[PDB]
């Protein structure tokens, strides 16, 4: 029941500062423009200890499955090959991605009826708000 409040189908309703976050990550111009237009559906499910997060949009369909605290390989939507570790910290899912000596952290939190996604690279944050579909 670790992630009960995250489970479901969620749709993007707002984004702030995403272009600058993507610049900080190293995403090129064309990908930033097309990715920034996307309105993804995030589908979160749990089966035993395995959490699955799918992101479906006109830009890309991605899927990760993982066990908390256990590192995995991820190809991100912008095609980075990263090493990821996701943990639960005080009810927040904390997702760290490492690649090429760089790091970014994505936090996912339930706040009221929203799922808030905070993406941080160096001092640049983007906040993306999802609501139930
Ligand atoms: C472009 C790389 C950074 C995306 C960071 C934001 C995120 C989201 O909104 O959930 C993270 C994620 O897990 N999948 C995903 C998929 C598509 C797009 Br566009 C955006 C996302």
Curated annotation (Swiss-Prot):
Q: Which residues carry this modification: Phosphoserine?
A: 14
Using the record's annotations, give every residue carrying the modification Phosphotyrosine.
21
According to the UniProt entry, its GO molecular function terms are: fatty acid binding; hormone receptor binding; long-chain fatty acid binding; long-chain fatty acid transmembrane transporter activity
**What are the BP-aspect GO terms?**
brown fat cell differentiation; cellular response to lithium ion; cellular response to tumor necrosis factor; cholesterol homeostasis; fatty acid transport; long-chain fatty acid transport; negative regulation of DNA-templated transcription; positive regulation of cold-induced thermogenesis
Per the UniProt record, one Pfam family is Lipocalin
Q: Where in the cell is it found?
A: Cytoplasm; Nucleus
Residues annotated for a fatty acid binding in this entry: 128-130
Question: What highest taxon heads this organism's lineage?
Answer: Eukaryota
Q: What are the annotated GO cellular component locations?
A: cytoplasm; cytosol; extracellular exosome; lipid droplet; nucleus
Give the residue ranges of motif Nuclear localization signal: 23-33
Which sequence ranges are marked TM in the entry?
none
**In the record, which positions carry N-acetylcysteine?**
3
| UniProt keyword terms in alphabetical order | Acetylation, Cytoplasm, Lipid-binding, Nucleus, Phosphoprotein, Transport
Q: Which PANTHER family match?
A: FATTY ACID BINDING PROTEIN (PTHR11955)
State the similarity comment.
Belongs to the calycin superfamily. Fatty-acid binding protein (FABP) family.
- Subunit structure comment from the entry: Monomer. Homodimer. Interacts with PPARG.
Q: What is known of its domains?
A: Forms a beta-barrel structure that accommodates hydrophobic ligands in its interior.
Known function: Lipid transport protein in adipocytes. Binds both long chain fatty acids and retinoic acid. Delivers long-chain fatty acids and retinoic acid to their cognate receptors in the nucleus.
Name of protein: Fatty acid-binding protein, adipocyte
The gene is FABP4
């Amino acid at each position: 029941h670790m992630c009960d409040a995250f489970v479901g189908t969620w749709k993007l309703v707002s984004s702030e500062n995403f272009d600058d976050y993507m610049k900080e990550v190293g995403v090129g111009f064309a990908t930033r423009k097309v990715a920034g237009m996307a309105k993804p559906n995030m589908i979160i499910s749990v089966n035993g200890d395995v959490i699955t997060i799918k992101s479906e949009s006109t830009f890309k369909n991605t899927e990760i499955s993982f066990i908390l605290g256990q590192e995995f390989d991820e190809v991100t939507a912008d095609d980075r090959k990263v090493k990821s570790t996701i943990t639960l910290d005080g009810g927040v899912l904390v997702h760290v991605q490492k690649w090429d000596g760089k790091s970014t952290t994505i936090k996912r939190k339930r706040e009221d009826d929203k799922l808030v996604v905070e993406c941080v690279m160096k001092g640049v944050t983007s906040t993306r708000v999802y609501e139930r579909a």
